[PDB]
Amino acid sequence: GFGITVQYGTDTNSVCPKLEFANDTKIASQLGNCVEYSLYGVSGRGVF
């Protein structure tokens, strides 16, 4: 048996599937724009 328990917000949500990153998903390259974001599991929409 394998039990899996997951927690969602005691720390940065740093346990993630691996992701290949594009350089158009950086924050610095999209300042002033409305973007969707996912930052270490934290998500929503906004302007950086």
């Binding site: 048996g1 997951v6 949500n13 346990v15 599937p17 924050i27 974001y37």
Partner: protein, 455 residues
């Protein structure tokens, strides 16, 4: 499977001349929701003399849609020659939620013979032909428009007297000008009025037979026909797809003069239609008898809320697209076409994302190695691996075992393998499968009471 008649025995297809310039016309007929264009009537019920909002699949107010026009082929006097078409077979569109079609809007107007711009003729209604399916790609020479596996074909025939719907595999023929042969451009259907549209006996297979020159029909699961009484009346056609199959809508069997669409058929097509195209059609008229054929317009559907005005007789004659503009939102909020003068607040104009930003921990894999080495503990001595600041992959672990039962609670299956977590805690132990149920939350047996319990 269904017998759909014999294969074509011709060694070659009729040559098709594609000259899109001639079909690049501007004859706009956008959806006018105030005139109830493009509306499919609420399906399980009717209403009388009321104005209500309704949620359903509707075209957008102001949508121009995609115009398609069929033409006469090439001729020399009394001997028709080459077919003349637009680049339609290669223009494959995403199906999404389906579409509605405005058919014969220009009928009775003086129009143009597309093949001969200086020649005018009275415009006649012509029915659209469609090819729909799950997967698309190219033909032998690299041109697009090939559909794979079963393809739904809606092919009007009998010079506009029947709609033939079939779901079959289309096997490109290899003859001259055919899709698997030499000198291929585009497949097209055709009929030859001179022999196919006699005043009495119309050839009910004229378009089917031309279709068959380009493709062999294989593993057909059905072929249905619907009758059409001839007229020059503007009509609407629509197609949608649900778990029950493909639904064909039309205004002509219920609201002929009004235009509201009602379902007339459901087809047993269960794979998802993702793509569609217009099958170009060319009429092999003699040079001296070319007609102008009405353009048809295809508009896409989406789940919109409309304000629908139901007359005493139940037809929808007027409507508001509640998301078109702010004025429309106002009418919908009061469920009326007439609201009092004033200044009103309406939904804000939303800012929409222009992109996305992502940051994730990227680095070390989370290490499930301990798990794989030595004798696992008993259930009361389970061992715990706590993963933080790492990249996880459950497949990497799951793929090493023959999984008998994998279930999740308070998280979806898709989510367990794709979300980010503060931590992932893995508790592993030896456990007989015969005691599977003793690990259930509802269990009152020894495992859940004294050995191991999940959060």
């Amino acid at each position: 499977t269904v017998d759909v008649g014999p294969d074509s025995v011709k060694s070659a297809c009729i040559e098709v001349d594609i000259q899109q310039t001639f079909f690049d016309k501007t004859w706009p007929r956008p959806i006018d929701v105030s005139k109830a264009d493009g509306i499919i009537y609420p399906q399980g019920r009717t209403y009388s003399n009321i104005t209500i909002t309704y949620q359903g699949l509707f075209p957008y107010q102001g949508d121009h849609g995609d115009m398609y026009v069929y033409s006469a082929g090439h001729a020399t006097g009394t001997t028709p020659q080459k077919l003349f078409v637009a680049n339609y077979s290669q223009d494959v569109k995403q199906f999404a939620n389906g579409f509605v079609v405005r058919i014969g809007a220009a009928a009775n107007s003086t129009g143009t013979v597309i093949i001969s711009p200086s020649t005018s003729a009275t415009i006649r209604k012509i029915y659209p032909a469609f090819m729909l399916g799950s997967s698309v790609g190219n033909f032998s020479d690299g041109k697009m428009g090939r559909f794979f596996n079963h393809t739904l074909v809606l092919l009007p025939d009998g010079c506009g007297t029947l709609l033939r719907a079939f779901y079959c595999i289309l096997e490109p023929r290899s003859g001259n000008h055919c899709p698997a042969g030499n000198s291929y451009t585009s497949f097209a259907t055709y009929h030859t009025p001179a022999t196919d549209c006699s005043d009495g006996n119309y050839n009910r297979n004229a378009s089917l037979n031309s279709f068959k020159e380009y493709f062999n029909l294989r593993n057909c699961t059905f072929m249905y026909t619907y009758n059409i009484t001839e007229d020059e009346i503007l009509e609407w056609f629509g197609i949608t797809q649900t778990a029950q199959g493909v639904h064909l809508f039309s205004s002509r069997y219920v609201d002929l003069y009004g235009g509201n669409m009602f379902q007339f058929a459901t087809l047993p097509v269960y794979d998802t239609i993702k793509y569609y195209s217009i099958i170009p059609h060319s009429i092999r008229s003699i040079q001296s008898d070319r007609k102008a054929w009405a353009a048809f317009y295809v508009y896409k559907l989406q789940p919109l809320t409309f304000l629908l005005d139901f007359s005493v007789d139940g037809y929808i004659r007027r409507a508001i697209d509640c998301g078109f503009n702010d004025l429309s939102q106002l009418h919908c909020s009061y469920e009326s076409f007439d609201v009092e003068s004033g200044v009103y607040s309406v939904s804000s104009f939303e800012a929409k994302p222009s992109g996305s930003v992502v940051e994730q921990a990227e680095g070390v894999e989370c290490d499930f190695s301990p798990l794989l080495s030595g004798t696992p503990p008993q259930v009361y001595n389970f061992k715990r691996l706590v993963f933080t600041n790492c990249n996880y992959n459950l497949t990497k672990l799951l793929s090493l075992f023959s999984v008998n039962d994998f279930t999740c609670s308070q998280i979806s299956p898709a989510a367990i393998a794709s979300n980010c977590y503060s931590s992932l805690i893995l508790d592993y132990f030896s456990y007989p499968l015969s005691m599977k149920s003793d690990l259930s939350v509802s269990s009152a047996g020894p495992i859940s009471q004294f050995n191991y319990k999940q959060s």
